[PDB]
Amino acid sequence: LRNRVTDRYFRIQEVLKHARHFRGRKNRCYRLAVRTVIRAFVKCTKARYLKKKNMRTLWINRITAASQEHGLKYPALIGNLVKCQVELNRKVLADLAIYEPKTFKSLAALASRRRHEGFAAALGDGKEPEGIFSRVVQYH
Amino acid sequence: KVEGDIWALQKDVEDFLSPLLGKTPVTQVNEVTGTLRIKGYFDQELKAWLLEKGF
Amino acid sequence: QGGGARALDLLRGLPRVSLANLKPNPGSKKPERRPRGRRRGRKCG
Amino acid sequence: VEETRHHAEVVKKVNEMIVTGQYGRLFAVVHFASRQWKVTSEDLILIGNELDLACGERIRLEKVLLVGADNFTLLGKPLLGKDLVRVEATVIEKTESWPRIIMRFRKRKNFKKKRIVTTPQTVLRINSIEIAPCLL
Amino acid sequence: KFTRSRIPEKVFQASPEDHEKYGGDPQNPHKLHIVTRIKSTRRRPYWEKDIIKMLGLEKAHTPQVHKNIPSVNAKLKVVKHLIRIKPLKLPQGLPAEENMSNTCLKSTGELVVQWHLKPVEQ
Amino acid sequence: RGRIPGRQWIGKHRRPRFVSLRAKQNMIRRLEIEAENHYWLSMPYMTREQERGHAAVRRREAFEAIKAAATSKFPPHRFIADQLDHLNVTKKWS
Amino acid sequence: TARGTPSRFLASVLHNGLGRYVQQLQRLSFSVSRDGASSRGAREFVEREVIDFARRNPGVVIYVNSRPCCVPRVVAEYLNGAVREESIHCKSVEEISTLVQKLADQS
Ligand SMILES: [K+]
Ligand SMILES: [Mg+2]
Ligand SMILES: [Mg+2]
Ligand SMILES: [Mg+2]
Ligand SMILES: [Mg+2]
């Protein structure tokens, strides 16, 4: 019995279909396209880490841009919102800085007020009571 | 050459070799072939035991 | 007694045994290994 | 001492805006599926896991971190009380993700393997976001 | 040649100024440890890697409870530069049978037996 | 200009490496954590004599479970129902 | 792949669930074979499972056409007009039951 490949056409079309949008001979020649489709798939897997990294970097720039309009720096906003137990991530703050400018200014005022409270507490030796917004809600 | 409900034979063998070993025996039950395979050598002990039941 | 009878009455409700529905005893025929694919192809052991 | 009573005046004014309904659309920030969503009413959100809920069922999102309006905003520390804000969503579509390519390749090592995964997904629609006058 | 290290016994001799700095009491030493690996076993000798496995410190930043006994302390003194050691404190005491489902180990080293997830009314 | 002979970080003439300000702070932070570890290892609860024999029973029982699992390795039972269930491949409607 | 495939924004059909929830699945067409092992899982699904499945979803019309065929298939038609055709060739009862329920949830 002699066996020959009869469905070799279907084995090469499943790889060439991913290369139809390429440029040059690497969209129709199986030998050339297979080495490009594999690299395209490899870049697809490794770009999932970059997309998460790039989104956060984009959010930081947008948060920084809006903070400067209110005379604040990015470390001064994120750092002082943590001490108020306001757990808002960069995704929300970037959205708030774009679609809710009035709400973002309220957060900037809260962060600025909390920032000023820490400086006042740093000047004292603990005799004066803590700031109004410096109180922390305890959970048991 | 075990016929009938072989799983009843396993329980009797387990309750019989346990005092000699101090622990439950490790047995393989092959219903298709009707054979019981027991880890360890119990040739002389089981041959006398099966003669008691009249097999 | 019960074991012998249970192996025959259960076979009645099953479809007809033919040359199609037969298979070897599991574990009695190891799959053949061929020098094909990534696992066994680069240098074929 | 002077600022403590000044806060009560502001809170009472904002609380007085809730009984009379002097607010329009409300946007709420909720924590769901380890993610914070800036959602409003009648919008869609895609969740990358199965909730084991039949489609059409109406549920409540318990965790709300921020509720805001045109003139007033309330902040949770870190969460708002269940007696102050209520966000309800509806399961409308449960489907699998589009095929994702997971391929790894190392040069000169004959290392190449391709995996395709379809993570389950769930779509929720926020129906209503209502608050209650419980600030005081 | 690079080999193991014999740490002098004087190193593990707390001074009176240390008891007023870390809050420990030599008269009443703590019963249990809270060991947490904070460093990679990579680029470290094989004997340090084995001790990490023996102590159940495979996954990093995963607290583990061990007994404050010389044999266990002997293993800790070998990988003392890869882990963080904190005493286990029991403000409510040892968990009972009814408090097994309500335990929670806080970052301060205290194990509470009533995890209510509710703001303090005080 | 500015060529470093050979490779950068190996050889006789290597590219100089300098310690930054945060690099010093990171090392100091590591030292403080380990300096506290030396304190908690200086207060054993029990001595060597007291500790001896306090876990012999548990250790002995733990290994007996390993021996039981190691000595219980045996082929699984073969049922007659499973062999007959392969005939269902030809089940059809009348 | 993303660049090699089309994409769309998240949306629904006529704002489903805004006022009421409407099951977007509209029709199911099963093509089972009286004879053939390929439909063994499908035939068992028709005998005991599709009857109870039709009880739960009254808004979906199910057609069971028994004709000779080598690959049994399930065709799902939706309100928006898209038609999804799936093959249940040699699948267990549980795998078919889960697959059909998935088609019901999709829009
Ligand atoms: K290999
Ligand atoms: Mg990150
Ligand atoms: Mg090879
Ligand atoms: Mg080759
Ligand atoms: Mg060079």
Dihedral sign from CA coordinates of G94, G97, G100, G104: negative
CA-closest candidate to residue E31, choices B21, C25, D18, F43: F43
Determine phi and psi for D18, rounding to 5 degrees: -95, -40
Q: What is the separation, in whole angstroms, between the first and last Cα of chain F?
A: 91
Of D115, D47, D49, the closest CA to residue A45 belongs to D115
Nearest to D54 by CA among D26, D93, D112: D93
Helix (H, G, I), strand (E, B) or coil at E12: helix
Measure CA of the first residue to CA of the last residue in chain C; give whole Å. Answer: 53
* Residue F63 burial class via C-beta count within 10 angstroms: exposed 0-12, middle 13-18, buried 19 and up: exposed
Structure determined by: cryo-EM
What contacts B28, CB < 8 A, 6 or more positions away? B36, B37, B38, F74, F75, F76, F77, F78
- Name the DSSP class of F72: T
Q: State yes or no: cis peptide before E119, omega within 30 of 0.
A: no
What are the two backbone dihedrals, phi and then psi, of residue B28, each rounded to the nearest 5 degrees?
A: -115, 130
Please give the single-letter amino acid code of residue C39: R
* Closest to G30 (Cα-Cα) out of G64, G5, G1, G3: G64
| Count of CB atoms situated within 10 Å of the CB of G41 | 20
Closest CA to A65 of A86, A96, A89: A96
Distance between CA E63 and CA E35 in Å, rounded? 6
DSSP type of residue D136: -
Give me Rg for the CA atoms of chain G.
16
Distance between CA atoms of G102 and G74, rounded to whole angstroms? 12
Cβ-Cβ contacts under 8 Å for A91 (sequence gap 6 or more):
A55, A59, D36, D38
- Residues G85, G89, G93: CA angle, nearest 5 degrees: 100
Q: CA end-to-end span of chain B, whole Å?
A: 11
List of chain B residues whose C-beta atoms are within 8 Å of the C-beta of residue C7: 31
For tokens 């290369």, name the residue.
A19
Q: How far apart are CA D35 and CA D30, in angstroms?
A: 8
Phi and psi angles of residue G57, each rounded to the nearest 5 degrees, phi first: -120, 95
Residues of chain C with Cβ-Cβ distance to B32 below 8 Å are 25
E45 contact partners, CB below 8 Å, separation of at least 6? E2, E4
The Å distance, Cα A41 to ligand 1 centre, comes to 22
Q: What is the CA radius of gyration of chain E?
A: 17
Q: Distance (Å, rounded) from C-alpha D65 to C-alpha A89? A: 11
Spatial separation of the C-alpha atoms in residues D111 and D120, rounded to whole Å: 29
Report which secondary-structure segment, H or E, holds D74: strand D73-75
Question: Using CA atoms, how far apart are residues D74 and D80, in angstroms rounded to an integer?
Answer: 9
Best mutation target among C1, C8, C10, C11 (most B Cβ atoms within 10 Å) is C1
Chains G and B touch (3+ CB pairs under 8 A): no
Residue with tokens 């009254």: G58
Rounded Cα distance between D48 and F25, Å, is 41
Query: How many beta carbons lie within 10 A of that of residue A95, not counting itself?
Result: 19
Phi and psi of B54, rounded to 5°? Answer: 90, 20
Would you say the C-alpha torsion A104, A106, A109, A115 has a positive or negative sign? Answer: negative
Whole-angstrom Cα distance, residue G84 to residue G102? Answer: 12
Distance between CA atoms of G73 and G67, rounded to whole angstroms? 12
Cα–Cα distance, G14 to D92 (Å, whole number): 12
Pairing of strands G25-32, E104-105: unpaired
User: Residue E6 CA to chain centroid, in angstroms?
Assistant: 21
Return d(Cα D86, Cα D30) in angstroms, integer: 10
On whether any CB of chain F is under 8 Å from the CB of B33, the answer is yes
| Residues C21, F83: Cα–Cα separation, whole Å | 11
Cα three-residue angle E15-E20-E22, rounded to 5 degrees = 90
d(CA E26, CA F27): 29
Is G47 in contact with G30 (CB distance < 8 Å)? Answer: no
Quick check: helix, strand or coil at residue A130? coil
Chain E residues at the A interface, defined by Cβ less than 8 Å, are 112, 114-120
CA separation for the pair B42, D108 (Å, rounded): 58
Query: In whole angstroms, what is the distance from residue C15 CA to residue A77 CA?
Result: 75
Using DSSP's 3-state secondary structure scheme, residue C21 falls into coil
Using only C-alpha atoms, chain F has a radius of gyration, in whole angstroms, of: 33
Would you say A132 and D3 are in contact if contact means Cβ atoms under 8 Å apart?
A: yes
Residues 6+ positions from A53 with CB-CB distance below 8 Å: none
> Is A138 within 8 Å of E119 when comparing Cβ atoms?
yes
Give the rounded distance of the alpha carbon of D66 from its chain centre: 9
Both ends of chain E: CA-CA distance in Å?
62
Chain F: give the shortest CA distance to residue E37, in Å.
Answer: 12
* Least distant ligand from the CA of A90: 2
What is the 3 state secondary structure string of A39-57?
Answer: HHHHHHHHHHHHHHHHHHH
Q: Is C3 on the interface with B (CB under 8 A)?
A: yes
Q: How many residue pairs from chains C and F have C-beta atoms closer than 8 A? A: 23
Angle between helix A101-123 and A90-99 (nearest 10): 120
DSSP-derived secondary structure for D86-126? EEEEEEEEEEEPPPEEEEEEETTTTEEEEEEE--EEEEEEE
What residues are paired with G63 via a beta bridge? G29
Nearest Cα neighbor of G93 from G51, G61, G34, G48 is: G48
Q: Give the 3-state secondary structure of residue G31.
A: strand
Residue-wise burial string across F16-42, b where 16 or more C-beta atoms lie within 10 A, e elsewhere: eeeeeeeeeeeeeeeeeebebbbbbbb
Judge: C15–F92 Cβ closer than 8 Å, yes or no.
yes
Give the separation between CA D110 and CA C40, rounded to whole angstroms. 11
> Resolution reached, in Å?
3.1
Residue carrying structure tokens 């390993």? F66
Structure tokens at C28: 């009695």
Question: Could you tell me which of A99, A23, E75, A44 has the C-alpha nearest to residue D102?
Answer: A44
What is the phi/psi pair of residue G39, to 5°?
A: -100, 15
Distance, C-alpha E92 to centroid of its chain: 19
Q: D52: how many CB neighbours lie within 10 A of its CB? A: 7
* CB E119 within 8 Å of CB A138: yes
The CA-based diameter of chain D, rounded to the nearest angstrom, is: 75
Determine which helix (DSSP H) or strand (DSSP E) holds E104, and give its type and residue range: strand E104-105
Contact partners, residue F36, CB within 8 Å, separation at least 6: E22, E85
Cβ neighbours, 10 Å, residue G91: 19
Neighbours of chain E (3+ CB pairs under 8 A): A, F
Residues 6 or more apart whose Cβ sits within 8 Å of residue E109: E34, E86, E87, E88, E89
Q: In whole angstroms, give the CA distance from residue G107 to residue G17.
A: 11
Rounded Cα distance between A37 and A22, Å, is 9
Place of tokens 């799936």: G86
G36 CB neighbours in chain F (<8 A) are 92
The pair of three-digit structure tokens given for residue D104, joined into one six-digit string: 């790894």
Tell if the CB–CB gap between E117 and A139 is shorter than 8 Å.
yes
Q: Which two tokens stand for residue F67?
A: 């021996």
> Encoding tokens for residue A55?
């989104």
Residue type, position B8, single letter: A
DSSP class per residue in E33-95: EEEEE-S-STTS-HHHHHHHHHTT--STT--EEEE--HHHHHHHTTSTTSEEEEE-B-SS-S-
Phi-psi region of D130 (alpha: psi -120 to 50; beta: other; left: phi over 0): beta
**DSSP 8-state symbol, G10:** -
Kindly give, in sequence order, each residue whose CB lies less than 8 Å from that of residue G95, ignoring residues fewer than 6 positions away. Answer: G41, G88
Paired strand residues for G66: G32
Q: Which residue has the tokens 């089981």?
A: B46
**β-bridge mates for residue D60, sequence order:** D88
How many pairs of residues across D and G have Cβ atoms under 8 Å apart? Answer: 45
Tell me the β-bridge partners of D123. Answer: D46, D93
Q: Is-contact G106 G25, C-beta < 8 A? A: yes
Give the minimum alpha-carbon distance from A140 to chain E in angstroms, rounded to a whole number. Answer: 6
The beta strands (E) that lie in G11-60 are given as 25-32
- Taking the alpha carbons at both ends of chain G, their separation in whole angstroms is 24
Token readout for A86 is 């306001």
Q: Helices (DSSP H) in chain A: which residue ranges?
A: 8-16, 30-69, 74-82, 90-99, 101-123
Q: Please state, in angstroms and rounded to a whole number, the distance separating the CA atoms of residues E86 and E96.
A: 23
E14, with CB counted inside 10 A (0-12, 13-18, 19+), is middle
Distances (CA, A) of F26 to C10, E40, E50, E83, E84: 75, 16, 27, 16, 16
Q: How far apart are CA G103 and CA B47, in angstroms?
A: 63
Using DSSP's 3-state secondary structure scheme, residue F1 falls into coil
What own/partner pairs with CB < 8 Å and gap ≥ 24 does E7-11 have? E7/E77, E11/F38
Q: Under a CB-based contact definition with an 8 Å cutoff, are residues D105 and D111 in contact?
A: yes
Alpha-carbon distance D43 to A12, whole Å?
43
Domains of chain G with bracketed CATH: 1-107 (3.40.30.10)
G62: Cβ contacts below 8 Å, ≥ 6 apart: G27, G28, G30, G50, G53, G54
